[PDB]
Every structure is written in C-alpha cells, then in structure tokens.
C-alpha cells in the first residue's frame, strides 16, 4: 500500500521506477495480478483525461470500477471524505482515486485510512500523476532532465500542475522558468525564475502552457488580448528551438493561452501527454497495491 | 472506419446489410472481434433507450465502456467537442457515441477525427440508429418497404426522428404521410404528404407517433386537448387497418400523443422497437470498426 | 421472480434464509448462475452505501451493470417509472434496483412489470435491504433476536429505516424502544415504546442511531445542541451494557446524532453494517432471479 498524494514526497528513485514501468506497459508488457479487485474513482471536480485515463488504466489491469460523483453520493447527506473512504473499504474497494476542491484534503486521510489513496488533484495544490506523465513525456523526448530548461506559463498560483512540476524538475536538475500576469504569480512557488514569455520561448527546451483557472479565481477579471500578451502566439512558437516541445496538461482554451493552429503543430506533445497518462496511471496503481 | 451521422448518406445497400446483421445478432450470432476494445458514450442530452441500448450493445460485444455527460467532464473547463474526441482517441477509445444539442455538430468532426463517430442525435437533425431500428421493426412486420404507407404524426418540425425516417422511407419505396399542428410542420422536410390524423389512420400500414419536443421549442405554447385533437385516441386506433402497427421512438407521453391504453395494445410495436435497438446498435458498431 | 419492496411482506422464514445465504456468501461461497446477466441501478436520490454495495454485489455475481440517475435519463422527457422499467426489460435487463422519493412508488409496479424490482428506498417508506443488513449484524452479535431490546433514536417520522426495522424486530421477538424529538415521532409506527435516550442507552442491547432527514422536512427548524439533547454523547455511551452495540444506517453526521469519537469505538458496528450490506444484497439478487 502506497499513497500518491504530493509530488514533493516522492523520491527520485520512485519516479525513475514509475517511468520505467510506464514505458514497459506502453511497450506492450501486460499484467493481470489485479484482476477482480475494485478501484473507486471519486471526482468532485470536472475531469476528462485524469478521470477516464484512470478508468482505462484500471480496466486494462483487469479491475472492477466504481465511479462516484459529488452530487449523487451521500456526501449530499453531509458525509465526510474520510467516511466515504472507510465506507468504500467496507464494501470491498482496494484503492481510491480522488479529485477534490480542497487543497491538501489528503493530509487527514493518509494517516487514518487503510487503503491506498491516489490524488487526482487537490484544489490548487498537487497533481502527481500529471507531473509523472509530464516527466515521462519530457524524458521520452530528451532522454534526460539535467541541463533542460523548462518554462511554465500563465496562471501559476492557481495551478496544482505548476506547483507539482516546478519543484520536481528542479530536483531532477532542470532549470525552471515562469511567466505570465504578475498578479497570478506564486510566492509559495520559488522553484523557478520569473521572466517574460518572449524571453523564455527562446531559451526553453520545453514550453509548458497552462489553462487559466477561471473557476478558481476569487474574482473574475478581464482577459481580453491574453493570447498576444501572455499566450503562445504563432510568432512566438516560431522562435522556439528546433528540438523544443510544446506541452499543456489540458484542456486547452484555443485562442487564449495558445494559438488555435499550434495545438497540433510539429513541436506539440499535448496529445502524446494524454497517451502517456494511461500507462503512468497503470504504473501508479500497481505501486499502490504492490 | 465508418461514421454514422445522417441517414440520408447511408446507401440502400448498407441499410439492408445492417438490418441483416442485426437479425443475425438478434438470433444469437456472436464473436470476440471487439472484445476488450473501448467505446465511449458522450451524452449531452437526456436519454434512456439510445444511451443504454448502446451500453448493452457494447457490452454484448465484450467492449469496455466509458460514460461521459458534459457536466462532469472537462467540457466544463471549455474543452471543445473535437478536443474531447481526440482526447478519447489518445487514451485508447476505439469508437464514440455522441448525442448533442447542436444540429450537425458532426459535420466539423468527421473530416478531422481518426475514430468512428456514431451520432446518437443532433438537436433536431438526424437520429440514424433510431431510423435503422424503425426500419428493422417495420421490415420484420411486412418483409418489405415497397408499397407501404407510413404516417408520422405530431411535432415534425423539431424531430430528428421524422427527418431521418421520411427521406429514407420514400427512398425505400414507401409512401409517407405527415400530420399534426400546422404550426409544427417542417418546410425543410418535404418528403411526405401533409394530411389529418383522422385520414392517415385508415390509410396507414404504420402509424408512427412523435413526442412533443417541449424542451426544443423557442417558446412554450398550450397543448390542452392535444390527445383528442392530434393524438392517437382509442377511437382512432380502432379504425386502423387490421394488419397495421403503432410505433413511437419513446419516451411516450401517455395522454398526450397517445391514449394510455394503447401503448401496450395488440397493434403496438413500441417496445419491440426498443428491443431491436440493441442489435441495430451492435451491428452499427461492428460496421464502424470493421 | 421475487420482488423486494417492504419488510412487512417478507416472512420470517424468507428472512432467516436470506441471512443464512448472506453468511455463506460472506464466507466466500459463490456460483455462476448469474454470470453475464444485466442489473440496472436506478437511483433518483443520493446514496453511497446502498447504490455501490449493490453495484459491488452485482459485479461479484458476475453481472453486467447499468447505472441510471434521474437527471440524465428520459425521465427528463416525462417518462414514467413504469415505462422506464419496461424499457430496461426490452434492452435485456434482468433485475432493477430503485431508490425513489415517492413513498410506495412500487405498488403500481409489482403487479405490472415482468422483472424483479428491488426497493433501495422509497421516500419515508421502506428500506428492506438496510433492515436485512441490520438483522444480520444484530444476529452475528447475539445469535438471536428473542429477548433483545433494540432502541431506535431521533427522526423516526421521516425514516424508512425505522419503519422497516420496528415491526420486523418485534415480529422476531425483540422489544423496540423509540427516542428523540417528540415532533419527529411517528404515529404510523407503533411497534415501539417512546422513551428518553438516557433511559434506553442503559436497557438496550442495540442502540441504533438515525441521521436527521433534513432534505425530507416540510420545514427546517433549529437543531442546536441536538447532540447533547437527543444524540449519543460520550457520557451516554459509557452507560451502555457491556455487550451492547452501536448501529447507524449511515451516513453519520458527526457531532449531531453521535459524538465524533464514537463512530469507530469498541461497541460500534456501523462499518460492519456496510460490509454485510454487499452480501445481503447479493443474497437478495439471487432470490429475485431464482
Ligand atoms: O485543468 C487544468 O487546467 C490543469 C489540469 N488538467 C487535467 O488534469 C486534465 P482533466 O481536467 O481533463 O482531467 C488539472 O489541474 O485538472
Ligand atoms: O426524444 C424523442 O422523443 C425522440 C427520440 N428519442 C429516443 O431516441 C429515445 P431516448 O431519449 O430514451 O434515448 C430522440 O430524438 O432522442
Ligand atoms: O439516509 C439515511 O440517514 C438512512 C438510509 N441511509 C442509507 O441507505 C445509506 P446511503 O444513502 O449512503 O445509500 C437511507 O434511508 O438512505
């Protein structure tokens, strides 16, 4: 039993092992050991990739799957997250995947519950499996992290993606750059140098775009002309290194943080990221259940 | 790869083959060609028959199923339908079933995506699997379409069922009649003769009833005494040909377009339609992935 | 085909049999008689234990599962519950599980539908599988019902649990005590003796707590200090018989009807209830389909 909650508490060796496993499974290697066991997907926030890649991963591992929403479950009757987990243990669930609006919802749980918890996202906190498939995608491309320059752009302080990726990339020996509206920068995220998109887009081996976390803002603010100012425009992408890649955890808001024509251009690895997500998540479930 | 979007682009030959395949599947034919493959059901409008007959179909084919609604997916974050399909492709989905409010949502998709799209309904546009199962049911009854007189009643204007059935029935050599409030007739559906229910009910070999598309009208209008005025009353049903049948795409609004006692009367094939739905949908999936 | 609607129509012999079957199931026994059949779970009210224990039970029986709610189905188009059930029969569903807001929704169905119906809860009416859970857990504890004193506390008026449990308990030879706010007492449930919590907690072999049915009240009222007044406080739990147990159909509102520290205390069988729920529900499904 191993939780996957925060990227900062996962060692370099474990990351290295998870990537190898994921790569092998992607290669065709299979395993049935978990056939018949039960996984529960609890998503209290909207999702497509994370949620359904987990379901695919679970079913490829031969597992039965229970899918829980926040509006149809007894959470409507005031049940706590912990009780929901204990309930799921009681009816035979072996592992739980959770996405929740509350930053660090898992701290209370990991010490109390008896089955592995896989964090599919905690508000603006952590997003471990996104980080892992990001790393995998990067390593597949450059076959190393050391000496890489990776720039993360946009709404940083509301991003569990950036918060997971910045520390671990630095830890793996890469240089991390930030950019975007100064208002949206993170003082709790020092693992990167704040520069401008125009500066970073030329020194970056990786250009990671972020969606604006509109649903997470205290107050809605104008974002007219965001693309020109902060986004990856065609002209900006044309100034990227030959070997550089474009990444984005999705969903993309075409015409906002990236030009519509770039999403599926030569240097884009956005959809490749989604492919790797499945195998990364298969690996993570195996790690969780031994 | 073969999409299924509009009935008007389905050849007479393809139709006949789908009906034959459906019959074989109905009579127990099976194979594991599709076992373990993934099907995704994207339903953005309510549904019971189409959605779940598809799920049953997919599972009888031995497929793994993913169910997406639109309020719990990342469409909520602004993701386009196109990006949603590509996302599903990336994670290993082989076929997508889509029901959407936007007429012809699929026109954009079919030229761009790399997996079969099965249209489960586009606003007031087309509803091909309904048409196919309607044809199957009629064919089981008369072993022919040539010379048949089929009347379609009620809210034609907002009916993707009427749109699909009218063109294809006349194309198959049937005579089509329309009835219902003149206000709800469709000038862009000229494949039938407009008459009154009272006339059509004695001339018809098939009486096809439609539900009022309340949720699709620009503004709500009274519908008091609809049954007596426009609907299939007991008195009207008693004037039907001895060998004529009653059909309805469902759900039925008992007391509106049809008298409560008729839904499961001798001449009714309403539930037989739902039965055929599964096999028609199996056949369509087999066609898409051949 | 044996429906399960209300406890009062379930004989003592049928009950003892379901409990023996659930025990054998709980010990690991299974068979293949239901492999590949279809179960449908129609939940129109929120639920965690009942809905997902049913799904688990179903999967453990080797069945395919269809999950329907209220907002995404064609109930939205005005389809009656009856037509919904008949529709499911037509597409190949062998048994239906239903939780609905309308008391006794099932009495118009039992005489009309052609497949077994399993009531997962009808408004403030009955909750048969919960009751069976309770009986099982109670029987596991004391190995008998005769001579037992069982107290049920709180919002009796709006409890389908209390209604199922009260009669069947006294029928099995146990004495039932009632407790809680006098306004929330039920005149349509006279199978117990109203007393104060402080009294019952000392004379009870089983102390069964109920959640306040806030979502079911015609008018909201204050419930300040509910714990200290009507609930199971730490102080009160200390005065329980040595061999007595705490039960609660869940979910619990920690701090309302029970002190936070008692939910998982030595005398609590609340989570054991959830465990037995699966096997009871397996047994009930086996009974429904012969
Ligand atoms: O939604 C974001 O922009 C980033 C990130 N996106 C994803 O995880 C992909 P999805 O919401 O389709 O599961 C996340 O934090 O949820
Ligand atoms: O909704 C109508 O009345 C006709 C038709 N109905 C169906 O296809 C059946 P369902 O909505 O239960 O899947 C449709 O256009 O969606
Ligand atoms: O809800 C209650 O407090 C009692 C009872 N609770 C249960 O059945 C458990 P659940 O709602 O998680 O399935 C019921 O009537 O729904």
Looking at the structure, do residues A117 and A131 belong to the same domain, yes or no? no
Give the strand order in the sheet containing A193-194.
A193-194, A175-179, A149-153, A206-209, A245-247
Looking at the structure, do residues B192 and B235 belong to the same domain, yes or no? yes
Domains in chain B: how many in total? 2
Looking at the structure, do residues B110 and B16 belong to the same domain, yes or no? yes
Looking at the structure, do residues B121 and B211 belong to the same domain, yes or no? no
Cα–Cα dist B207/B184, whole Å: 18
Q: Is B143 in contact with B108 (CB distance < 8 Å)?
A: no
* DSSP calls for A60-93: HTT-EEEEE-SSSSGGGGT--HHHHHHHHHHTT-
Cα–Cα dist C68/C64, whole Å: 13
Looking at the structure, do residues B160 and B103 belong to the same domain, yes or no? no
Looking at the structure, do residues A71 and A170 belong to the same domain, yes or no? no
Size of interface A-C (CB pairs under 8 A): 73
Q: Is C40 in contact with C93 (CB distance < 8 Å)?
A: yes
Looking at the structure, do residues C165 and C254 belong to the same domain, yes or no? yes
Give the strand order in the sheet containing A117-122.
A64-68, A38-43, A95-100, A117-122
Looking at the structure, do residues B70 and B51 belong to the same domain, yes or no? yes
Note the residue count of chain C.
290
Return the best residue to mutate from B7, B42, B49 for the ligand 2 pocket (most ligand atoms within 8 A of CB).
B49
CA distances from C28 to A150, B117, C24, C56 (A): 53, 43, 7, 14
Looking at the structure, do residues C103 and C175 belong to the same domain, yes or no? no
Residue with tokens 């096997």: C279
Burial of B84 (0-12, 13-18, 19+ CB in 10 A): buried
Phi, psi (5° rounding) for residue B268?
A: -80, 135
Burial of A221 (0-12, 13-18, 19+ CB in 10 A): exposed
Residue of B76, B90, B92 lying closest to A271 (CB–CB): B90
Q: Residue A70 belongs to what domain range? A: 1-126+269-290
Q: Report CA(B219)–ligand 2 centroid distance (Å).
A: 20
Residues of B in contact with A59 (CB under 8 A): 38, 64
The secondary structure of residue B134, as a DSSP letter, is H
Residues of B in contact with A100 (CB under 8 A): none
Ligand 3 atom closest to the Cα of residue C48 is 12
Could you tell me which of C114, C99, C134 has the C-alpha nearest to residue C22?
Answer: C134
Looking at the structure, do residues C107 and C190 belong to the same domain, yes or no? no
Q: Which 40-69 residues of chain B touch chain A by CB within 8 A?
A: 40, 64, 66, 68
Closest residue CA from atom 8 of ligand 2? B50
Task: List ligand 3's pocket residues with C-beta within 6 A.
Answer: A 74, 77; C 47-51, 121, 127, 130, 160-161, 211, 249-251
CA distances from B13 to B9, B16, B19, B171, B277 (A): 11, 5, 10, 12, 20
Cα–Cα dist A12/A9, whole Å: 10
Partners for A (CB, 8 Å, 3+ pairs)? B, C
CA B174 to chain centre: 18
B26 touches C: beta carbon within 8 Å: no
Q: Is A210 in contact with A248 (CB distance < 8 Å)?
A: yes
Residue B50 counted as an annotated binding residue: yes
What is the stated resolution of the deposited model, in angstroms? 2.6
**CATH number for the domain harbouring residue A281:** 3.40.50.1370
The secondary structure of residue B268, as a DSSP letter, is B
Looking at the structure, do residues B32 and B94 belong to the same domain, yes or no? yes
- CB A48 to CB B78 under 8 A? no
Looking at the structure, do residues A46 and A164 belong to the same domain, yes or no? no
Peptide bond before residue A137 is cis, with ω within 30 degrees of 0? no
Strand B206-209 relative to strand B149-153, pairing: parallel
Q: How many CB atoms lie within 10 A of CB B149?
A: 18
């Amino acid at each position: 039993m191993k939780h996957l909650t925060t990227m900062s508490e996962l060692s370099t060796e474990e990351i290295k092992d998870l990537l190898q496993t994921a790569q092998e499974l992607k290669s065709g290697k299979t395993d049935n050991q978990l056939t018949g066991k039960f996984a529960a997907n609890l998503f209290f926030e909207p999702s497509t990739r994370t949620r359904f890649s987990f379901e695919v991963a679970e079913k490829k591992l031969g597992m039965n799957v229970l899918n829980l929403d926040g509006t149809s479950t007894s959470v409507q009757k005031g049940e706590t997250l912990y009780d929901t987990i204990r309930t799921l243990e009681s009816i035979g669930v072996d592992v739980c995947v959770i996405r929740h609006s509350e930053d660090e919802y898992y701290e209370e749980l990991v010490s109390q519950v008896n089955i592995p918890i896989l964090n599919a996202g905690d508000g603006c906190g952590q997003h471990p499996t996104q980080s892992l498939l990001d790393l995998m995608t990067i390593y597949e491309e450059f076959n190393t992290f050391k000496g890489l320059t990776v720039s993360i752009h946009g709404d940083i302080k509301h991003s569990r993606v950036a918060r997971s990726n910045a520390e671990v990339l630095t830890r793996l020996g890469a240089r991390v750059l930030f950019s975007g509206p100064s208002e949206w920068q993170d003082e709790e995220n020092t693992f990167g140098t704040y520069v401008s998109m125009d500066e970073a887009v030329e020194s970056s081996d990786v250009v990671m775009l972020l969606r604006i976390q509109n649903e997470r803002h205290q107050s809605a603010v104008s974002q007219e002309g965001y693309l020109n100012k902060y986004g990856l425009t065609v002209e900006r992408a044309e100034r990227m290194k030959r070997h550089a890649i474009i990444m984005h955890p999705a969903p993309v808001n075409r015409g906002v943080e990236i030009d519509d024509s770039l999403v599926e251009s030569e240097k884009s690895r956005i959809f490749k990221q989604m492919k790797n997500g499945v195998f990364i998540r298969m690996a993570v479930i195996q790690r969780a259940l031994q």
